[PDB]
From a paper:
Kinetoplastids are evolutionarily divergent eukaryotes that have an unconventional set of kinetochore proteins. In this study, we focused on KKT2 and KKT3, which are homologous to each other and have three domains conserved among kinetoplastids: A protein kinase domain classified as unique among known eukaryotic kinase subfamilies, a central domain of unknown function, and divergent polo boxes. In this report, we have revealed a unique zinc-binding domain in the KKT2 and KKT3 central domain, which is important for their kinetochore localization and function in T. brucei. In this study, we show that KKT2 and KKT3 are important for recruiting multiple kinetochore proteins, including KKT1, KKT4, KKT14, KKT22, and KKT23, while localization of KKT2 and KKT3 is independent from various kinetochore proteins. Together with the fact that KKT2 and KKT3 have DNA-binding motifs, these results support the hypothesis that KKT2 and KKT3 locate at the base of kinetoplastid kinetochores and play crucial roles in recruiting other kinetochore proteins.
Perkinsela is a highly divergent endosymbiotic kinetoplastid that lives inside Paramoeba. Our sequence alignment suggests that PkKKT2a and PkKKT2b have a CL-like domain but lack a C2H2 zinc finger. We determined the crystal structure of PkKKT2a551–679 at 2.9-Å resolution by Zn-SAD phasing, which confirmed the presence of a CL-like structure: Two β-sheets (residues 551–647), followed by an extended C-terminal α-helix (residues 648–679). The CL-like domain of PkKKT2a overlaps closely with that of BsKKT2 (RMSD: 0.79 Å across 39 Cα), with the exception of some differences being localized to the loop insertion and the absence of a C2H2 domain in PkKKT2a551–679, consistent with our sequence analysis. Taken together, our structures have revealed that the CL domain is conserved in BsKKT2 and PkKKT2a. Our fluorescence polarization assay showed that PkKKT2a551–679 has DNA-binding activity with a dissociation constant (Kd) of ∼500 nM on three DNA probes that have different GC contents (50 mer CEN is 50-bp DNA sequence from the CIR147 centromere repeat in T. brucei). To assess the importance of the CL domain for DNA binding, we next performed a fluorescence polarization assay for PkKKT2a551–679, which has mutations in zinc-coordinating residues (C646 and C649, corresponding to C616 and C619 in TbKKT2) and found that it has a similar DNA-binding affinity compared with WT PkKKT2a551–679. Taken together, these data have established that the CL domain is essential for the function of TbKKT2, which is consistent with the presence of CL, but not C2H2 zinc finger, in Perkinsela KKT2a.
Residue numbers in the entry: 567 to 678
Amino acid sequence: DRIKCPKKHGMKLLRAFPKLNDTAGGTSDYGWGFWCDRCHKEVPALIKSKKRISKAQDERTHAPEENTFFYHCHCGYDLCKACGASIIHASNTLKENYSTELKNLAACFSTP
Ligand SMILES: [Zn+2]
Ligand SMILES: [Zn+2]
């Protein structure tokens, strides 16, 4: 699922720094990389990792320090991979505690 910026727009996962045309403001130049609007990390270059060990590993969760991509919003709000990783983890945990609580609810209902 697409991560949203605080202004509720759906952000996009990018594998290369965007062009002037991708950000709302005129002057956003991502030539030397950007800063995460949340953990303030200065991510200066996008690197291609050769690990490739993702048969069934969410790419967004594996090797968060591996800045192989980032999330950008047109508004200009950005998230490093690491910050994206923690919201996928947190949201997956909510879905798990939901399906679990739902299976337990069905069981409590259909058990005397
Ligand atoms: Zn961050
Ligand atoms: Zn935005």
